[PDB]
């Protein structure tokens, strides 16, 4: 990963965006110019934000960096930056970087600044457990088991993603700065123990329950949690709801699509003081019965309206053959469970069968 001869910047920087960041870093004339590798060990920092840089194809060559500002830029692939063993400081924002297992051997590396990447696997921060600040601002993370190795962290970024389990961030007790806002957050208990935080966010988390049945009476367990494991009792609570600790209550004689209930909650963990602001959304779905009629007797199932019914095993009469299902007892519309489907009221199927042949 060596020049041993001079040779044209344009000729190790394959990127032409790249190669003028490299002549104007080392106050060459032109991209055509020649370069050797004591110059190129010459660079220990390299500043190229907003620069339209595709690739850092050529950067290897660079032994010595320690700081890397690349910023705005249309980067995907960092495998070049993968041996570069003295980078300390590395500033990716604004790229497409998903692959971070071209990462692990930057043990010197202190600071990781990947916000607005797309990025939802960070599984390979797990070879930098030498971390002292990350910042992961809008990405599409989930999963941040991998933080619990990064004992090193003083300073979090996780602001603007989908993070709903912070158990992993339990231990992390250096961290002075965590950024928490714009996540899916309910239970503080995490946190308790960050007892060196000074700056603490917390706004805007948005909480998704899996759907359940609508109901005229429903009720919705309150998983707002504080850092002692405490319910939040909620601030206002949609469609008239109540509060009767620890659940949600509503009465709902019309169906709706979703009920909610938002709530606050000053948070102060160390010398940190957070405002935890949310709201818990909870997805309704419209169901009615459907009665199963055997010669009258009856099964009852729950569908959805506007959703296909699947067809139940059909019913073995002894001496009869299983015709279908029909509208009307003794007539009416066959139901094809392929075509017709659920209707926004209860109603009744009713097996017809007929003669053995």
């Known amino acids: 990963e060596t020049i041993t001869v001079p040779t044209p910047i344009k000729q190790i920087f394959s990127d032409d965006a790249f190669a003028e960041t490299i002549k104007d870093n080392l106050k060459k004339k032109s991209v055509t110019d020649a370069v050797t590798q004591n110059e190129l060990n010459s660079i220990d920092q390299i500043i190229a934000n907003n ?5 850092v194809q050529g950067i290897q060559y660079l032994p010595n960096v320690t700081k ?31 692959d971070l297992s071209s990462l692990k051997d930057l043990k010197k590396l202190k600071s990781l600044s990947l916000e607005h990447n797309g990025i939802s696997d960070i599984n390979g921060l797990v070879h930098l457990p030498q971390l002292e600040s990350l910042y992961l601002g809008n990405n599409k993370i989930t999963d941040i088991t991998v933080l619990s190795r990064l004992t090193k962290l ?18 992390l007790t250096k ?13 503080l208990r995490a946190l308790a123990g ?22 005229s009476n429903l009720v919705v367990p309150n ?10 009792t909620p601030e206002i609570i949609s469609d008239d709801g109540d509060y009767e600790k620890p659940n949600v209550k509503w009465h709902l004689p019309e169906f709706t699509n979703e009920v909610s209930f938002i709530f606050y909650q000053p948070v102060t963990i160390g010398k940190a003081k957070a405002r935890f602001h949310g709201r818990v959304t909870q997805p309704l779905k419209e169901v009615y019965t459907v009665s199963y009629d055997v010669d009258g007797e009856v099964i009852k199932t729950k569908v959805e309206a506007g959703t296909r019914i699947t067809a139940p095993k059909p019913p073995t009469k002894q001496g009869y053959v299983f015709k279908g299902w029909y509208t009307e007892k003794n ?27």
């Not at 961290?175 to 239970?187: E, F, G, T």
């Not at 960050?194 to 109901?215: A, M, R, T, Y």
């Not at 066959?334 to 209707?343: L, R």
């Open 51 to 55: 620069s339209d840089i595709k690739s």
């Open 68 to 98: 890397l500002f690349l910023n705005g830029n249309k980067l995907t692939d960092i495998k070049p930056l993968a041996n570069l063993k003295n980078l300390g400081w590395l500033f990716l924002d604004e790229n497409k970087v998903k």
């Open 154 to 171: 003083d300073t979090l970024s996780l602001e603007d993603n989908q993070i709903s389990d912070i158990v992993p961030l339990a231990g």
């Open 175 to 187: 961290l002075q700065n965590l950024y928490l806002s714009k996540n899916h957050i309910s239970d």
């Open 194 to 215: 960050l007892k060196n935080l000074d700056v603490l966010e917390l706004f805007s988390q948005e909480c998704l329950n899996k759907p359940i049945n609508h109901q």
């Open 223 to 232: 998983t707002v949690k504080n850092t002692d494991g405490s319910l939040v």
């Open 331 to 357: 007539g009416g519309h066959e139901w094809n469970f392929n075509t017709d489907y659920m209707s926004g009221n209860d109603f009744t199927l009713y097996a017809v069968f007929k003669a053995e042949t």
